[PDB]
């Protein structure tokens, strides 16, 4: 177990880490005039990923889903803790898994600074992520105002389709979600509210609506879906997009004025306006310019 | 699961929390001139606690073992995240478990500011603890010097005895360890090195010896054991004390000069000098003034 840490999880720490792996706790010197942003998310084998998922993909997604919650605040990710409960000690598995962890960390300039390694009957992983943001400038789930656009990044429904069609190209969106870190940072001071879409667009937008004490009207034909989902029947397409989940895209609200400023930035991801915030505290849908009753 | 969070894990925190439970991440405004101290430890049902352990004790210990690693740095604890994987939703269990979480947090002035709640086949808990310490003043596992006293707080072996004698009063030490938070803070500026005894005195002192590139000679009859263990045959007594684990006491090294200073403080726990640091890089034992060969 102590050898497991040294063998797989003790790459040299960044110069930006006061004390990394090796002691009872890690130490971080805060950057000035910034708040600590902190979150944790658990992945349970067979629940948050198929049992047969490659160890590298498990490692990647364990980090990615937590970076997504830092990004959903408009913050910049800094470091993570890794808590893993393992049924067995398998070198090939541990090599792939740790490679997955570090590949995702390195993509986004994040340090692995600590954690815990235990034995347990079922593979269970909890990553804690830490980031920093200019004091007072976090993008909350509250903050959405009547007249704001509702927007979402990338595509929604991919991962859900992937889960139900394993082996299909869209499985890559299930196994390797992309946390939208740079977009989150670019939305600081532009977005009036934000959440990452981890459970499903309707449910997660719903948290914003409830927190902001507003409602929204979405346009079904504007939901950004993969060409593959564009070719399946409407009803199923919209279910994948609205209740699929595991997208790890950012859903946010923004004034038309700030939206124009957003579109003028160089962004590493697609942005789509899918509706607007309204006064009535309900989530409703529009299609071809008419009300569209829809149960999700 | 959203009902669970609201019903059991959403009490108002200390004023020192910029944003607590309810958003994608929590926000903390760092106190000036302090470093973030951060750790995580997992408890797996049946492994880190007997399956029949009361939910209140499970909640208490989940927090306590993590406050212990904050204390082991000399730092002051501030807040925790709670990640729980639950096989079933049981109201009586959740009431007891959450009461245990909050009882430990409240005793030590700690806020529960976030976490994750999931379904899984086996009860698994990971708490992340966050604390703060004056920049540069952490007590590391490195730093022990030849001639330094080796010391330990409280009693060692209680929890291990309790585990093997479930039903005995010493089970209290297994179920309800006390993190030595105030002692940890009082050892800032005095201890030359420190670790908390979670795995066993010999093993955990061993991490200090390895990090400091020194050895130690312990005096077996000076080990602080319960009167109950004083009545056991000495070999088994010393095995509980040196290899029992789950003590969550602090083991630290300290100059004779600084030990005198320590004893002048008003402390909330027993402190015992049990040996001293030596040049040769080995852990050895002495009994009644003679070398005492002992395998842990
Ligand atoms: N999977 C992991 N990834 C990264 N760091 C880890 C991991 N597991 C453990 N660590 C780090 O390795 C060091 C030793 O960990 P550990 O033995 O769990 O310390 P501890 O909490 O003080 N003891 P214990 O309470 O018995 O678990 C610490 O600095 C941990 O933060
Ligand atoms: N057991 C818990 N104790 C304390 N806070 C919790 C707990 N579970 C969840 N929370 C908090 O409750 C809020 C909602 O949690 P959660 O639904 O897990 O958010 P999320 O990470 O954005 N979504 P997801 O990735 O699907 O898990 C967050 O502010 C969490 O930090
Ligand atoms: Cl273990
Ligand atoms: Cl779940
Ligand atoms: K730790
Ligand atoms: K947010
Ligand atoms: K979260
Ligand atoms: K330490
Ligand atoms: Mg420790
Ligand atoms: Mg999340
Ligand atoms: Mg640990
Ligand atoms: Mg989220
Ligand atoms: Mg520990
Ligand atoms: Mg979560």
Residue numbers in the entry:
A (entry chain B), B (entry chain A): 3 to 298
Question: What text comes from the article?
Answer:
As part of the standard SSGCID pipeline, AbThiL was initially crystallized as apo protein and with AMPPNP/MgCl2. Diffraction was much better for nucleotide-bound protein. Initially, AbThiL was co-crystallized with 5 mM AMPPNP/MgCl2. Crystals from condition JCSG+ G10 (20% w/v PEG 2000MME, 150 mM NaBr) were cryoprotected in two steps with reservoir with 15% v/v ethylene glycol (EG), 5 mM AMPPNP/MgCl2 added, and vitrified by plunging them in liquid nitrogen. A strong anomalous signal for both sites (13.4 and 8.3 sigma) in the AMPPNP-bound structure was additional evidence for potassium, even though no potassium was added during crystallization. By comparison the anomalous density for the phosphorous atoms in AMPPNP is slightly weaker with 7.9 sigma. The anomalous scattering coefficient at CuKα radiation is twice as high for potassium as it is for phosphorous. All of the structures were well resolved: For the structures bound to the substrate/product pairs, residues Met1 or Ala2 through Phe304 or the C-terminal Ala305 could be modeled, while for the AMPPNP-bound structure residues Glu3 through Ile298 were modeled.
Thiamine pyrophosphate (TPP) is the biologically active form of vitamin B1 (thiamine) and is essential for all living organisms. The same study also identified genes essential for growth on nutrient agar using high-density transposon mutagenesis, and found thiamine monophosphate kinase (ThiL) to be essential. In this study, we present high-resolution crystal structures of ThiL from the pathogen Acinetobacter baumannii (AbThiL) bound to substrate Thiamine monophosphate (TMP) and substrate analog adenylyl-imidodiphosphate (AMPPNP), and bound to its products TPP and adenosine diphosphate (ADP). The AbThiL structures assume the same two domain fold as MfThiL and AaThiLwith an N-terminal A domain and a C-terminal B domain.
